[PDB]
Amino acid sequence: MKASRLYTLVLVLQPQRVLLGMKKRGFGAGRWNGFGGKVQEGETIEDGARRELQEESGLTVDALHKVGQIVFEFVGEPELMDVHVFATDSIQGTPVESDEMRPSWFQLDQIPFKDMWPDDSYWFPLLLQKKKFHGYFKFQGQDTILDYTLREVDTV
Ligand SMILES: Nc1nc2c([nH]c(=O)n2[C@H]2C[C@H](O)[C@@H](COP(=O)(O)OP(=O)(O)OP(=O)(O)O)O2)c(=O)[nH]1
Ligand code: NA
Ligand code: NA
């Protein structure tokens, strides 16, 4: 089995809109996504999620709620990406374009699935329904899913 590297993903989800960022470079460039990145040495996963939100979007939040976990495997890459997914409804500040991301709000009847990672079509609806989830997706390149597992859980 492969080793895994810890990542976070943060979704700012208000009652009628969600904040996403257009990834301007790096992994997932050209796709709308939540905010996140690698967890660093000695920080808790939640604190790494708060840090990444602030670094990429300029937003601070006092607390985050863990909503899911997704493991990503890419053909031809030796490590798994273990993504810990968090949500908040309560933000401080206005989003700021960073080098990584251009933030934009989307109404919840206009979730830009065609411009998001393909797996998001599977798990994002669960997030909207307040259902915690564990997932795993194997990709060949950026577009093609070869295998995946998704399950609702009571405890993330
Ligand atoms: N929505 C979604 N997010 C994903 C998928 N795969 C995946 O790694 N992510 C998230 C986890 C992280 O938020 C981000 C990947 O982290 P990153 O490469 O931006 O990390 P970083 O900020 O530390 O990278 P860098 O600035 O050092 O280049 O994408 C996916 O299929 N769907
Ligand atoms: Na980052
Ligand atoms: Na990032």
3-state secondary structure of 73: strand
Identity at 144, one-letter amino acid code: T
The pair of structure tokens assigned to 33 is 């996504």
In sequence order, the 6+-apart residues with CB closer than 8 A to the CB of 42 are none
Helix (H) or strand (E) holding 135: strand 133-140
Please count the residues of the chain: 156
Which ligand gives the minimal distance to the CA of 32? 1
**Nearest CA residue ID for atom 5, ligand 1:** 117
Q: Which of 55, 85, 117 to mutate to test the pocket of ligand 1 (most atoms within 8 A of CB)?
A: 117
Question: Cβ-count burial of 34 within 10 angstroms (0-12 exposed, 13-18 middle, 19+ buried)?
Answer: buried
- Count the alpha carbons within 13 Å of 82 in the hemisphere toward its beta carbon: 9
CA 77/CA 81 separation, integer angstroms: 10
CATH topology of domain 1-156: Nucleoside Triphosphate Pyrophosphohydrolase (3.90.79)
Cβ(144)–Cβ(74) below 8 Å: no
Query: Cα–Cα distances in Å, from 100 out to 2, 52, 135, 147, 150?
Result: 28, 11, 25, 29, 28
Give the phi and the psi of residue 125 in degrees, each rounded to 5.
-60, -35
Q: In whole angstroms, give the CA distance from residue 154 to residue 100.
A: 33
**Which ligand is located closest to the Cα atom of residue 39?**
1
Ligand 1 atom showing the smallest separation from residue 36 Cα: 13
Closest-CA residue, ligand 1 atom 32, reads 117
- Which residue in 40, 38, 122 sits closest to 84, CA to CA? 38
Q: Residue 76 annotated as binding?
A: no
Task: In whole angstroms, give the CA distance from residue 73 to residue 137.
Answer: 6
Q: Is 72 in the pocket of ligand 1 (CB under 6 A)?
A: yes
User: Looking at ligand 1, which residue's alpha carbon is closest to its atom 18?
Assistant: 27
Resolution of this entry, Å: 1.4
Query: How many CA atoms lie within 13 Å of 5's alpha carbon, on the beta-carbon side?
Result: 11
Contact 88, 18 (CB under 8 A): no
Please report, for residues 3, 39, 121, 144, the alpha-carbon distance to residue 6 in angstroms, rounded to integers and kept in the order given: 10, 6, 22, 23
Give the distance from CA 111 to its chain's centroid: 14
Are 108 and 101 in contact by the 8 Å Cβ rule? The answer is no
